[PDB]
Design a protein around this ligand. Structure first.
Ligand SMILES: NC(=O)c1ccc[n+]([C@@H]2O[C@H](COP(=O)([O-])OP(=O)(O)OC[C@H]3O[C@@H](n4cnc5c(N)ncnc54)[C@H](O)[C@@H]3O)[C@@H](O)[C@H]2O)c1
Ligand SMILES: NC(=O)c1ccc[n+]([C@@H]2O[C@H](COP(=O)([O-])OP(=O)(O)OC[C@H]3O[C@@H](n4cnc5c(N)ncnc54)[C@H](O)[C@@H]3O)[C@@H](O)[C@H]2O)c1
Lengths: 361, 361
């Protein structure tokens, strides 16, 4: 069962509750923008449906500093290292990428890395910021161990998403946004909620036995007794080594340049300090340094249009490109609202009650 | 059957034959270095075993200009566009990346893109150049249509490799280097030669029927009647959409910034002009702008060491990291030589005969 709430309601509510729990006002705006962006785009695991447990409960457990802003550790013409000061990933991310964009506009390219940060929601959000300014945007984050290396029998790597935003001449930019593992953990939380079984390729119990029940992974992976597979699965034959290497790429970019916790150290240091401390990276490339922007947008569109025009495999109506599915969901939800599960509705009611933030139900 | 030839013999021979067919001397050096690099690293599809048909025969058919050098079209502080002037990809690539490195050293980051170029051998080579200079190196190329989009029944995308080179405190750098499709076409040429069947996930006949016989793909994909799958296979469930999006990423980076042929236009324009005209991109990120180099090398090593130390799945002795397999092959071949198929030996003899380039057999 599900209840329809408008985007505006969800937007405003998130921002009021973040103020009530003592966020800096601009911080509340940055965080709710990237949270609602997840709901607008159909990443239902990364906005309101996770507002209470992943953000509010964590501010309550002192795991996030809601008034914190990043600090410049080392800055050059085209680069920067930021200490996240245990703030919102969305705060560090928004500032970091805006900063990378600013540097790209002045010099051609920009890269900003972050240490000592927290969960930053959808990777795609920061890449979208870059595409709106006529830059190619590449970004990612590490996360707590959930994914096994190739030939591994133990969670060691985060789901380590990579997002790539590229200006387009269409109504939406190209935007790849996804984990370097086949599945993220949030899809498992989702599949438990609606009581579906998961695909066999996504995860395995210790010893390599495939998982069909989403609960098995979620409970055992923090125990080091279950794990997710990289893109490419578990055999080199299907391409396992590639997703695994790409996962590591993300990890190194996220931790090695900023000196952030990596791999098993994320969870281990949370057991000591109470806080998940993570890294992020943000790259911006100024298109107009290479070619006219509209001429470039046209070329990207031409690639997309060509791709969608190729022969479709029987059984399938259409071919998509990166970010197409998200645009159509965004158009749908913008006008008709978002169908939220009952648990989320009840979480919202509870927050409304606690912080005296009015709700229309 | 196979005949052992030393790396030095292969190295020198390649360079003499390239001089004999009228290459600029420095060009012969750049090309043979990146060709032998393929043989040193165990990419047996991209060095001497392909010397005759992919390079020499093509210079003979006017498809490569062997004295050509790239031309600067548009240059900024951190960026550049090059016209490859129909030269060797290895020439354009080496110059392009060296140029991106040079800019990274001065400003923090560098990006050079190339249009109107040719086959550039192993992507990993250019990334290795960056890692040797203490930069993160990211690079790629587009190629003729061989790969189907997700839900597609037709080859449209190249195998579009992506290589990432990262400085390490180990004896070899981290180096991911591979196609964005599960398999490249060269692995198919290889499997025909030694008469093995290919995995079921790699390719399909028109209509989606898996291919077991490597010959079926090789003959039908240029006809538009067979195709390779992206990393992730053909179903979204296994992650198809990801490899597919990554493939497109490579394509856009390779063609849209430099104005190179893209997708179906590569083959189509070769049918008109006689020449495969391609794009490439090369990114270099100066580590020391962020963190001490050795401290960074140490962190990368720590990631690798942690990864290799995790529990190994029963049936498997060890876990590898990007570029490990290549280093061990390189160490082996450096001292004991390279076991070349009889066809390659015979190709070499023929070139020796034609161009009066001495061989020890
Ligand atoms: N913050 C974190 O630590 C973290 C960790 C993991 C994932 N995430 C987020 O979770 C979200 C979902 O990630 P996911 O791994 O489940 O991705 P996914 O499998 O849902 O794939 C999403 C991407 O693939 C594209 N796509 C989907 N189908 C396609 C098709 N048929 N053709 C072409 N493109 C197609 C979409 O446009 C989008 O770019 C992402 O927004 C990601 O940033 C965050
Ligand atoms: N020039 C072109 O147009 C073109 C096109 C396609 C491919 N290529 C080249 O072909 C070569 C082979 O490509 P491929 O797609 O067959 O790659 P592949 O499947 O052989 O994988 C190679 C990469 O994966 C790593 N690897 C392998 N096993 C691993 C493991 N168990 N754990 C961790 N890492 C592991 C290697 O270190 C290497 O980085 C590459 O050098 C590529 O550049 C070139």
């Amino acid at each position: 069962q599900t209840k329809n709430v408008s985007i505006d309601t969800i937007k405003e509510f998130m921002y009021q509750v973040l103020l009530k729990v003592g966020s800096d006002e601009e911080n509340a705006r940055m965080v709710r923008d990237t949270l609602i962006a997840a709901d607008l785009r159909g990443m239902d695991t990364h906005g309101i449906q996770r507002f209470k447990t992943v953000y509010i409960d964590r501010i309550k457990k002192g795991m996030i500093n809601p008034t914190a802003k990043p600090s410049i550790i080392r800055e050059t013409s085209t680069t920067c290292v930021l200490d996240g000061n245990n703030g919102f990933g969305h705060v560090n991310g928004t500032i970091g990428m805006k900063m990378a964009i600013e540097k790209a506009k002045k010099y051609g390219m920009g890269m900003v890395v972050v240490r000592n940060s927290t969960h930053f929601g959808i990777a795609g959000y920061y890449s979208l910021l870059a595409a709106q300014e006529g830059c190619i945007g590449i970004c990612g984050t590490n996360a707590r161990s959930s994914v096994a290396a190739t030939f591994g029998d133990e969670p060691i790597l985060g789901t380590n998403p990579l997002a790539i935003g590229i200006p387009s001449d269409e109504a939406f930019p190209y935007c790849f946004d996804g984990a370097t593992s086949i599945s993220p953990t949030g899809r498992f939380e989702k599949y438990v909620r609606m009581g579906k079984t998961v695909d066999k390729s996504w995860a395995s119990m210790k010893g390599g036995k495939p998982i069909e029940d989403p609960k098995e992974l979620l409970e055992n992976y923090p125990k080091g007794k279950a794990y997710l597979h990289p893109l490419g699965g578990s055999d080199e034959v299907s391409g396992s080594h590639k997703g695994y290497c790409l996962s590591e790429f993300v990890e190194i970019m996220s931790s090695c340049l900023s000196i952030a916790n990596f791999l098993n150290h994320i969870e281990e240091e949370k057991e000591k300090s109470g806080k998940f401390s993570l890294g992020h990276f943000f790259i911006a490339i100024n298109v107009e340094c290479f070619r006219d922007l509209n001429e470039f947008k046209k070329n990207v569109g031409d690639i997309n249009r060509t791709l969608r025009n190729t022969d479709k495999l029987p059984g399938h109506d259409r071919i998509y490109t990166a970010g197409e599915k998200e645009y159509e969901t965004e158009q749908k939800r913008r006008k008709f609202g978002d169908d939220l599960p009952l648990v989320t509705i009840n979480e919202m009611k509870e927050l409304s009650s606690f912080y005296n933030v009015p709700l229309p139900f």
